């Protein structure tokens, strides 16, 4: 509906890379300790997918320090800052939830390399 639209289209980043699930993306979110506003990196396999427009967001699982983690990101939020697809992946399944259950040697995904 045109009644919205005008709000949403002016509020979308257009530069966001066309990332695909299972891409080993690295995201550099902003963080403010207080005065400082330094970046923080966050490597990981993608597991979810966006697709709502301005509301679109994507999830990233990682495994770190012996403790697995996950973190959604609002695609058009300013805090996300830089977003690199890094290493690619291929999975042929829109939501890689079954990875939450797996680990180690079985936890790998292989390059599309086409």
């Amino acid at each position: 509906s045109n009644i919205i639209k005008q709000l949403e289209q002016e509020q979308m980043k257009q530069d966001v890379p066309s990332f695909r699930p299972g891409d080993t993306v690295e995201v550099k979110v902003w963080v403010v300790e207080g005065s400082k506003k330094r970046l923080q990196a966050f490597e990981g396999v993608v597991i979810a997918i966006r697709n709502r427009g301005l509301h679109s967001a994507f999830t990233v699982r990682k495994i770190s320090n012996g403790e697995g983690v996950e973190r959604v990101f609002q695609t058009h939020s300013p805090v996300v800052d830089s977003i690199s697809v890094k290493r690619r992946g291929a999975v042929r399944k829109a939501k890689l939830y079954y990875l939450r259950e797996r680990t180690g040697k079985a936890a790998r995904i292989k390059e599309r390399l086409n």
Binding site: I3, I4, L7, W30, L54, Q74, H76
Partner: protein
């Protein structure tokens, strides 16, 4: 003082670029021209009678089109009165608009709640559920005992029980006006106002400080 009469269109987030996701409810606010200006000399009290967005002429009844035939042009979907205090406003469709709210900090919006149509206990007044098992007999969700044994001898009036729910009125109070906007007539309130999308809204500056 007077608020205006709008039309909920249904929710969106907006980012403040310093870095926070503020939810907001979008509201079209077509200008609300007055139709009559009731006062003590008019037999009554200070008030204004405003109409709003366009309605087909063919539905309009003769008494109505005649009521708009005086003063203000072109009938809207309906009418609403609003109270006054030292507010001088002519009967001419002065077309009060969105920009009036720019001074306001917090507001109201009085909606029309979605129709549940049945309630019953639990969904309505949030009565607690009885045991789902350990032998419960045909009472997994019944209202339960509703009075004392005999010396009242009656169920008290005002008892909480099953019945129709929602679809009434209920206001909101507070609500930051995250963004007044003209040339478009949009009102970005800080989220969550009663009523299904496209329902009429009756917005006023908050009586609370």
């Amino acid at each position: 003082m007077i608020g205006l009469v709008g039309k909920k269109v249904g929710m969106t987030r907006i980012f403040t670029e310093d870095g926070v996701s503020i939810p907001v409810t979008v509201i079209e606010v077509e200008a609300n021209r007055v139709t009559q200006v009731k006062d003590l000399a008019n037999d009554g009290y200070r008030a204004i009678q405003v109409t709003t967005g366009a309605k087909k002429a063919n539905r309009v009844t003769k008494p109505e089109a005649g009521h708009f035939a005086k003063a203000g042009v072109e009938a809207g979907r309906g009418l609403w009165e609003f109270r006054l205090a030292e507010g001088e406003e002519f009967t001419v469709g002065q077309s009060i608009s969105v920009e009036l709210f720019a001074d306001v900090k917090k507001v109201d919006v009085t909606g029309t709640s979605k129709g549940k149509g049945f309630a019953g206990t639990v969904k309505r007044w949030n009565f607690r559920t009885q045991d789902a098992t350990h032998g419960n007999s045909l009472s997994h969700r019944v209202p339960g005992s509703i009075g004392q044994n005999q010396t009242p001898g009656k169920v008290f009036k005002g008892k909480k029980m099953a019945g129709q729910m929602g679809n009434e009125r209920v206001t909101v109070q507070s609500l930051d006006v995250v963004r007044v906007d003209a040339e478009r007539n949009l009102l970005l309130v800080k989220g969550a106002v009663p009523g299904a999308t496209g329902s009429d809204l009756i917005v006023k500056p908050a009586v609370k400080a």
